[PDB]
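Internal ticket #5521
Category: modeling
Description: The requester needs a full-assembly model to guide mutagenesis choices. All entity lines are attached below as received. Residue total reported by intake: 1416.
Assigned to: D.W.
Attached entities:
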Amino acid sequence: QIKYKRVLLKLSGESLMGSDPFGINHDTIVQTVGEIAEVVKMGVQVGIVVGGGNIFRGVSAQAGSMDRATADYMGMMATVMNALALKDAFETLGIKARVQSALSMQQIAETYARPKAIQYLEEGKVVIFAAGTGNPFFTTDTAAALRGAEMNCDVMLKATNVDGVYTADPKKDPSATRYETITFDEALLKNLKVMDATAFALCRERKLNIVVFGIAKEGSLKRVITGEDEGTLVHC
Amino acid sequence: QIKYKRVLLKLSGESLMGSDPFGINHDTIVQTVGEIAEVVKMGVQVGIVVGGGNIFRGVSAQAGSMDRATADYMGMMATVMNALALKDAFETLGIKARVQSALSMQQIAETYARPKAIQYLEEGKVVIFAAGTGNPFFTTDTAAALRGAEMNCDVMLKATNVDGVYTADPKKDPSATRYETITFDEALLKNLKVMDATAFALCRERKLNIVVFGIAKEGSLKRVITGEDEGTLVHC
Amino acid sequence: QIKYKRVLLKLSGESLMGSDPFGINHDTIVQTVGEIAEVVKMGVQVGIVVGGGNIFRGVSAQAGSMDRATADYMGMMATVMNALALKDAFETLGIKARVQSALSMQQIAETYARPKAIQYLEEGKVVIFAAGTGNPFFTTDTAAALRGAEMNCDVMLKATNVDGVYTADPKKDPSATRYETITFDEALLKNLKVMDATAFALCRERKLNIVVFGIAKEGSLKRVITGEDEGTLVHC
Amino acid sequence: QIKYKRVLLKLSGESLMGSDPFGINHDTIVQTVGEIAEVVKMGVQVGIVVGGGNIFRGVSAQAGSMDRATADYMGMMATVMNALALKDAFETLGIKARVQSALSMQQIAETYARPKAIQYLEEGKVVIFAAGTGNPFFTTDTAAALRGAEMNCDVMLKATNVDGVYTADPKKDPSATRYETITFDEALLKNLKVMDATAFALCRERKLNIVVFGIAKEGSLKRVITGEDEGTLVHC
Amino acid sequence: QIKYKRVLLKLSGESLMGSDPFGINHDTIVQTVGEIAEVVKMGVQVGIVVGGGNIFRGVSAQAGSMDRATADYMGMMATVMNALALKDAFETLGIKARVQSALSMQQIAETYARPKAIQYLEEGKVVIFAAGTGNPFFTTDTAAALRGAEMNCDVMLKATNVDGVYTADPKKDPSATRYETITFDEALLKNLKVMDATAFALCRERKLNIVVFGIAKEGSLKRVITGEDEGTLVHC
Amino acid sequence: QIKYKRVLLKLSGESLMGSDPFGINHDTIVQTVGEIAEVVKMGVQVGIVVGGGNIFRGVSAQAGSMDRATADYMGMMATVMNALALKDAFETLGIKARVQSALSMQQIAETYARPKAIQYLEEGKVVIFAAGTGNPFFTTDTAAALRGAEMNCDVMLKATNVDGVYTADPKKDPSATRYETITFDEALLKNLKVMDATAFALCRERKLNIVVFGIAKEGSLKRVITGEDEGTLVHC
């Protein structure tokens, strides 16, 4: 029935953007939350680390002439916005969700705390991690590996705009094939794009396997959770 | 020389958007900052309260489907992003600035604390207040009034897309006139929309005068603080 | 049986003062807590926003020559004292209660957080909100509307020294009559005293109805909760 | 010239009450502040620990019926109120003052942090410590000792309703004498109540000398810091 | 069956040191946690205040030339380390444990809060109090009395390297006898070593009885909890 | 005169241990501090990131049996202890220093905040960063890089038990040579272990140059900041 009991779902801000060129598209987020809700109702404990690219865009231009760290702090503030909207959407579906921020925040969100988050998962709630790792110069993928290892998740579900890992950029090379399973070293030796070095190393060092898939492809989240053939499995 | 020593300048997030559809427009924010950097060098202590309408656009549509309290929190997060961008802008021009948030932030900003805010104002720095009043259901203009009165500002400068208060909409009828100066009661009596009732009410009770004025027009700010004829002055 | 499931009870500090000229009168608070306990045991979820006038009195005089904001901060510190004593009194009756402060406090009380407070209500505990809205220049009534709207309460129970809304000050006009029901506009058109403008506007804008009643009039809290004829109902 | 450079002055909340039955008496607080403003201008770094007995009166009766830990917390809240009032008083006389709380406060005060407190003392400001030790069951005098030793104060000044330590109660017998100077051991041996045992014990272990003295008597403070004959000196 | 329902177990850092000359000895802590686990599974609610002498040793030498307060802060940081390891050890045995610090800490531990800790005990979890009282110049024993009184524990279990209270130092006087029961005054009159004055006074003033025993003596924790003859009972 | 104006000096906890088996060795810490106190007086702004290996030794054995996240937290607590000891050392030599923690601490230290850290650096103070990145699974060297780049340091000084990077281990073969200067890519290509990959990767992306060098050797630090030939320089 269920292959992965506890998962850390990594969603980029862009995933909530749909076709729009900025922000959150109501239809996309509803479709996404609903799909996550489905696996939760199947009893899966879900942890979500969400990015802020969809909202950073509106401030990307100015970022250029800003101190990178500061630009990154705005990015983190952007994730919190997606975290909030994401939670609101779950409550609408009858699923309770809690937002834990890596940087302490008064009323918008609870501060990250391992014991509480684990509990929340157990209590059947979706835990949404905001503000990445709390530090600049680190990617969302990195924050996903960190929270994943901390939450003792069975695997990290890296959701992307491609339904898996290809021998080469499929969107620009129709003859590209999707790997069904690959190793960390293989991914490296083959210069395959899975995630940034730092995040990749963290997943290895913590023995956190990764499944790359395309969330927007209706039904694949459930397929991966159930063990069907979907996306690429990267293991150590 | 100087008409107003300490001023609380209210900036809508939209005033940093320029002609863009969303976010922060580089040339616009650089222009606005520069103009304030001008009065600052003239010995004016300036506190800023900024909205998040420009960034809120990308999540506005979704907001409608969300709880309002949660929507306002996203609005407050948006203002933090503008506050950082603004703060960084000032540094580039050699001016020192600090970001105070109504809600506690870990490393993005310092929590609001009157004694320190006033402290900075004396040290001749720019203080940008973010997160508004820290509470949902309150408008940015109310935050400005709150902070303006708390900071013991000589006047609140309401920057807007108009150079003053008119007896009628000039854009949709070039036959009206720009009030040079009105009184709170007259404004209310003549249904002149200066700001929402709560915000407006606070200024009166704290006896904080307002000066509505378009900041896009170069020189406008420089004019108001010097005492020239510019924008409407709502006083008591 | 029960007309209002979730209520925000607004108690002024003076209500806990009884006949004494300052502070908390043991007999009054016990009578008050007991009455609130009764409706909780009937299954009503109660949220309480409490004032500090009864304790502010001792420092009222000095306040006069103090900066208003500072005077207001003392008021907020006063509510926390009533919040504490109020909680202690419930624990004595076997009812668990939690104090959420609008301003973060280390060990005296938990910081306000919407998700937790809602939960507390559901868990059958009385939630007592202290420190108003966290900002100076705002009344307790305002803090009651805010928390009320945030807690999604069915109605706000404004407890006062009069058993309802009269055509004129009853304590000084024996021929005054009590309205059984009135509208927001009616209350305004008639210059009826319900609460301050800001708080009143917030209740309207959030569609939070109000029931004005006299808590000290033994048995009326239960009567209002049950639907009997008691106090004045102000709705939009 | 100056006998004590840095001093930790202990003020009971009652010493701000004057002849009133409760709260803060305007003329009294203005008198007391003024007297300290005097030694401050003389280059004395002054830290203050204030009790809350004056405000605690209005809730004392109820306290008896409450848990003691909770009662002490209300006592600590009371001290914050006096701290603010005191702080404001100093500003009026042109003196800068900061309020450090043992327990974290959001905007009412700054959390205690030694490096900053000492910082202020050097900057020639008045530092008023509130919330005592931050723990229930500890007396105000213990907080004074704690802070006195932490601040590396030359001496702790215990202001009281008496101008010194006597061989017997002078009020209830005008035949005793005011010890000019005693030693901790002598005090204990002769059962001279200077302060509770814990507080007293701390001063000795940290080697912090005490100077009991009535502050109501004009000039008293001025006398002690200058070295004149005034109040008992408990030393080691 | 069970004589003490809720206990505050005071463990010195040295107890976790075993024979080693520094730090935590895996075997000792496992033996200790297991023994505590046994009484928890019997339904006893356990509160633990732990010291840091075992880890302070490594920095004792440098402490000598440091400001005492600072030296004490390092001690508190040391308790947190034992608190952490202590918790980890319980989780391994299947017993949930929470670490509450007297000084607020972001992700390492929850800040001390009476309502939550009581709850935790009730929920069957072991609560471990770290950082003493939060202030320098106070012993661990003192922190044990404080938390004990706050948690309304039935008795404070002072674990030590001696199996009770002797007529004189047994390790250096073979003819020393163990008291089975003694009074506070008796302990004092006889100059018996139970704990430091401050801590002792606090236990008396709060009517918190004390049982002195040797935790390392396998099986005595259970014996004391069950009412058997073990250790010395000090009561008021 | 000065080669590097602002430097981020990385100190392993072991470098404060001297020849001892654990903890902090008085003569060693006094020597190391003194050496830095030297370059500071020369107008060099110095930020420090210190590890906790020296203190972690006493809990290392137990760590193996604990969850790694929890082990790393104990490691971070250890670094706070070294930070305090270090800070105190500087005071003794008349130098002012402040301790910034990645994780919020109540009174032991100030929470990390870039604007203030840079503030201090300009005020000519020593800033000691503790708790590393604030996240588990990240090495001390990564924290150094993070902070180094955040602080806009001219270079990161990696103090170690070796005076530079060699073509081969000199200790286990006196036939190699100390690279005078290498480039990131060369280092990686030649498998020269300078620091873990993540840490190393960050320095390159932020363009932060490293200068590996043994600090035990008196004069070493003094040499590097002046520009003399000392230790390997890994640049881009």
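Resolution: model delivered.
Comment from assignee: Chain D is about 40% helix and 20% strand.
Ticket closed.
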